[PDB]
Amino acid sequence: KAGPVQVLIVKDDHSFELDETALNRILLSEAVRDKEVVAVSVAGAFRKGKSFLMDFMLRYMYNQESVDWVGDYNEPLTGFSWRGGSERETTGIQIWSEIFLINKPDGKKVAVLLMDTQGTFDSQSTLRDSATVFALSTMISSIQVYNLSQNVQEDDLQHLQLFTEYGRLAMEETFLKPFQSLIFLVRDWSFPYEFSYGADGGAKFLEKRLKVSGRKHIHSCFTNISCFLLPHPGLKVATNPNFDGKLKEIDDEFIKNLKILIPWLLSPESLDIKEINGNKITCRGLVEYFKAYIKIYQGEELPHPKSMLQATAEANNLAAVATAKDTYNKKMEEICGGDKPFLAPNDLQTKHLQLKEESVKLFRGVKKMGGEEFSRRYLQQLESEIDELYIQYIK
Amino acid sequence: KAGPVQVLIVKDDHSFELDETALNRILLSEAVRDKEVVAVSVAGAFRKGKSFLMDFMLRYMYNQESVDWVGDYNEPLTGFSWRGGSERETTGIQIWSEIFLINKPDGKKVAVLLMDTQGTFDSQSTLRDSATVFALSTMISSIQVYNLSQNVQEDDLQHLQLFTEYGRLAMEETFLKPFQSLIFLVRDWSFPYEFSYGADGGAKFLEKRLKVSGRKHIHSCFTNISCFLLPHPGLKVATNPNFDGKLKEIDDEFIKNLKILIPWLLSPESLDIKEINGNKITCRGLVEYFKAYIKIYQGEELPHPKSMLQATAEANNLAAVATAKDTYNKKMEEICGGDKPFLAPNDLQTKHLQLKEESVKLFRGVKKMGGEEFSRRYLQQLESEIDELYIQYIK
Numbered sequence: 199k200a201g202p203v204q205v206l207i208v209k210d211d212h213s214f215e216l217d218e219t220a221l222n223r224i225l226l227s228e229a230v231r232d233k234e235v236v237a238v239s240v241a242g243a244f245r246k247g248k249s250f251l252m253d254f255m256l257r258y259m260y261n262q263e264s265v266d267w268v269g270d271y272n273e274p275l276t277g278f279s280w281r282g283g284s285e286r287e288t289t290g291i292q293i294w295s296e297i298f299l300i301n302k303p304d305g306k307k308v309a310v311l312l313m314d315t316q317g318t319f320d321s322q323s324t325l326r327d328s329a330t331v332f333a334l335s336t337m338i339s340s341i342q343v344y345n346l347s348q349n350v351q352e353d354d355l356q357h358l359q360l361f362t363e364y365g366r367l368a369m370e371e372t373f374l375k376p377f378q379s380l381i382f383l384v385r386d387w388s389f390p391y392e393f394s395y396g397a398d399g400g401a402k403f404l405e406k407r408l409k410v411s412g413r414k415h416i417h418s419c420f421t422n423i424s425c426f427l428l429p430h431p432g433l434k435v436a437t438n439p440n441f442d443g444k445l446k447e448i449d450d451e452f453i454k455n456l457k458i459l460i461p462w463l464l465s466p467e468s469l470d471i472k473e474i475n476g477n478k479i480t481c482r483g484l485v486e487y488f489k490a491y492i493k494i495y496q497g498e499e500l501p502h503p504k505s506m507l508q509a510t511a512e513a514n515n516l517a518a519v520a521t522a523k524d525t526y527n528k529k530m531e532e533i534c535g536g537d538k539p540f541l542a543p544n545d546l547q548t549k550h551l552q553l554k555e556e557s558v559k560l561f562r563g564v565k566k567m568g569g570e571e572f573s574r575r576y577l578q579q580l581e582s583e584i585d586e587l588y589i590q591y592i593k
Numbered sequence: 594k595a596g597p598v599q600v601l602i603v604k605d606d607h608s609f610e611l612d613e614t615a616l617n618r619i620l621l622s623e624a625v626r627d628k629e630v631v632a633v634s635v636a637g638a639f640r641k642g643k644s645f646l647m648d649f650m651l652r653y654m655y656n657q658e659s660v661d662w663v664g665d666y667n668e669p670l671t672g673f674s675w676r677g678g679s680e681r682e683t684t685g686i687q688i689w690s691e692i693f694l695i696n697k698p699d700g701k702k703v704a705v706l707l708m709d710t711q712g713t714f715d716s717q718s719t720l721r722d723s724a725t726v727f728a729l730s731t732m733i734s735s736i737q738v739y740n741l742s743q744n745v746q747e748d749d750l751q752h753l754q755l756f757t758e759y760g761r762l763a764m765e766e767t768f769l770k771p772f773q774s775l776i777f778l779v780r781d782w783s784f785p786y787e788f789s790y791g792a793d794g795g796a797k798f799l800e801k802r803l804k805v806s807g808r809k810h811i812h813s814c815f816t817n818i819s820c821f822l823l824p825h826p827g828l829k830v831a832t833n834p835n836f837d838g839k840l841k842e843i844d845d846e847f848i849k850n851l852k853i854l855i856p857w858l859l860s861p862e863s864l865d866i867k868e869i870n871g872n873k874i875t876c877r878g879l880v881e882y883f884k885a886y887i888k889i890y891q892g893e894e895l896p897h898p899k900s901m902l903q904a905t906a907e908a909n910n911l912a913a914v915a916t917a918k919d920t921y922n923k924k925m926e927e928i929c930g931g932d933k934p935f936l937a938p939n940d941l942q943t944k945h946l947q948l949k950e951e952s953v954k955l956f957r958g959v960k961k962m963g964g965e966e967f968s969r970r971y972l973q974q975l976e977s978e979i980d981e982l983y984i985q986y987i988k
């Protein structure tokens with residue numbers, strides 16, 4: 199009892215495989231199934247310290263009220279763990295097997311769901327998958343902790359909007375925002391002199407970072423958006439898989455901020471209840487929603503992502519292809535359409551071949567991306583097109 | 594004397610501003626101007642430890658033959674530095690003011706040019722600029738040290754190919770590879786248990802990393818391609834701008850690898866001479882080439898980069914736009930072209946409006962990215978297009 203449980207997962211064959219029975223044996227029990235739920239997710243790439251963080255989340259949820267829940271400064275990090283043995287990189291969602299019930303300030307009794315959500319981003323291949331998982335994760339989650347490494351890279355925002363897009367695609371679309379809360383968690387922040395560790399520093403840094411979209415429609419998607427800056431834990435944590443050592447051996451700033459961060463996220467008040475279309479949700483509602491969403495993504499198709507490179511080339515060649523088709527069409531009409539139509543089912547061919555060739559030389563001569571085998575496909579397009587402009591011969 | 598000198602730089606107004614006179618007062622002196630040159634560049638984003646590394650490059654080039662050039666383990670890092678005061682983030686190229694002359698194994702006397710090359714990548718805006726600078730940097734450089742942070746991110750490769758593309762655009766294109774040497778330098782590698790620190794570990798890691806393009810046409814571009822894995826220097830270095838402390842206070846692995854890395858790159862033998870079109874080049878040749886290249890990029894245009902998001906949406910809507918135009922065209926011909934042509938300059942309109950509307954409802958009903966204001970531009974396209982298919986009325 200009490201361990202991590204795989205609930206969603208993409209397979210090699212890009213097949214999203216949900217585990218409904220395990221999804222049931224934890225969230226559909228008579229004990230939680232009727233309580234309104236708060237689902238906390240920690241989402242990011244593989245090997246970014248998500249499980250390390252989620253362990254401390256446990257340390258707090260299991261010793262919540264009381265103590266140095268963070269633990270004895272001189273004993274090792276003991277207890278329940280999401281870290282398994284030989285870690286395999288996987289795309290999907292894991293949840294913690296034990297739901298927590300705890301008491302809100304307003305006497306409410308509430309079910310607390312932790313999810314690890316993990317994606318890959320190693321190729322146009324795995325991207326689509328990851329975005330789909332992140333999309334799902336976020337639309338069943340009450341708080342998405344987007345766990346990012348040193349900064350907020352163009353990538354990270356790009357990817358964020360993307361999976362944000364995927365979510366709306368599967369959603370009705372009220373006059374409420376689609377999702378609840380987002381938290382940009384920046385790990386191993388190393389510029390406390392520019393922006394300070396924590397939420398204050400986060401806020402500011404995020405501000406300045408977001409003002410670089412010549413937008414923040416991320417704000418259209420989320421009711422609440424915050425940012426926390428977390429320090430490097432130190433080399434012992436950083437370079438040791440399965441860390442093991444005393445609290446002491448972790449950087450002191452790191453732990454001091456962890457201490458504000460976990461309760462910041464998980465303290466009874468800050469605990470925030472999942473909801474959809476303006477309606478607070480119950481563990482069971484969740485499961486059926488999760489199932490609903492997944493059902494969709496399986497039926498109708500998710501737009502394959504087109505990368506910056508592939509796309510920038512496609513635009514490069516097309517511009518040649520069009521520049522060329524242009525100077526052909528213009529010279530042709532100059533002498534073939536309007537008050538000009540002096541007939542002649544030959545010489546029509548002659549000027550055509552004459553011009554078509556000038557365009558081809560025009561195109562082919564242009565410096566362009568991707569090279570021969572790639573551009574040739576566009577040269578062909580250029581050709582079959584001016585031939586369609588060649589049915590500019592009627593009468 | 595002996596400091597960093599700005600030689601290229603992009604301004605707010607995206608105007609590449611070369612400093613020819615400073616470019617002359619160092620590389621066109623009678624003393625270096627006729628010696629064959631080896632140009633070492635260290636290229637990457639802002640705040641990635643390039644100057645810190647280049648300092649140690651100096652420590653070696655100035656104490657080359659002899660000593661613990663790395664310096665007294667108990668004294669601070671003293672001497673010449675590329676670190677200025679208040680660091681402003683800039684896109685461009687800086688070179689070290691003093692060229693080094695040194696003796697190759699084969700008695701050759703040779704000029705050594707260090708460049709810092711720095712780009713930004715904060716927006717589709719700044720990307721193009723950075724790629725242009727990186728393109729230039731690489732085509733006047735003898736060795737490009739691509740200085741990357743924790744791993745090799747899809748970004749980093751994407752960006753790499755891109756600026757690689759830009760270089761060819763400005764190059765004649767022999768049957769030789771365009772560029773000489775590339776080195777993937779990975780900073781703060783934290784998985785020595787998966788791949789080891791240094792060149793051995795690098796090689797392997799790069800291998801496995803590159804086999805994720807379902808390509809490595811990076812290999813088409815470069816005669817030699819290697820990878821070195823470098824450890825985190827420690828928190829004192831990491832979190833202190835302008836580091837100052839004793840050698841001792843830097844992580845011992847880091848320095849031990851630095852010690853193999855600098856000579857690996859810069860030792861007299863490993864020193865490799867710049868060349869273009871198969872021809873060894875001289876400082877002066879370089880300067881005129883550098884100038885030649887820059888002249889080009891100013892005249893003819895560099896393809897603006899199209900991002901994954903913008904592009905993936907464009908493909909999403911177009912697919913709707915085409916699916917829709919399809920079921921219109923088909924139903925139309927079913928009753929309007931071929932052996933069917935039963936005339937009727939009305940009802941022609943009726944079925945048309947009838948079908949056009951069915952397509953629009955078909956399109957608009959489809960779930961798609963970017964939302965209203967964005968999709969509307971595609972709805973219009975859908976319309977003016979089936980109206981062009983509406984000149985399917987002739988006779």
Ligand SMILES: Nc1nc2c(ncn2[C@@H]2O[C@H](COP(=O)(O)OP(=O)(O)O)[C@@H](O)[C@H]2O)c(=O)[nH]1
Pocket residue numbers: 243244245246247248249250251281385386429430431435436437438439440441783
């Ligand atoms: N640099 C850094 N390393 C961490 C952090 N947290 C954990 N690590 C280490 O990074 C490695 C991967 O950690 P893990 O939590 O399994 O990453 P996950 O796959 O995202 O869950 C382990 O060696 C951890 O000890 C952090 O905040 N910063």
Ligand SMILES: Nc1nc2c(ncn2[C@@H]2O[C@H](COP(=O)(O)OP(=O)(O)O)[C@@H](O)[C@H]2O)c(=O)[nH]1
Pocket residue numbers: 388638639640641642643644645646676780781824825826830831832833834835836
């Ligand atoms: N994490 C890490 N930090 C470094 C490294 N080298 C330097 N730093 C620190 O990172 C900050 C920026 O360094 P700097 O060399 O000016 O980066 P640059 O703008 O790319 O030249 C400073 O506080 C350095 O002390 C490294 O290899 N890893």
Ligand SMILES: [Mg+2]
Pocket residue numbers: 248249280281
């Ligand atoms: Mg993990």
Ligand SMILES: [Mg+2]
Pocket residue numbers: 643644675676
């Ligand atoms: Mg610098």
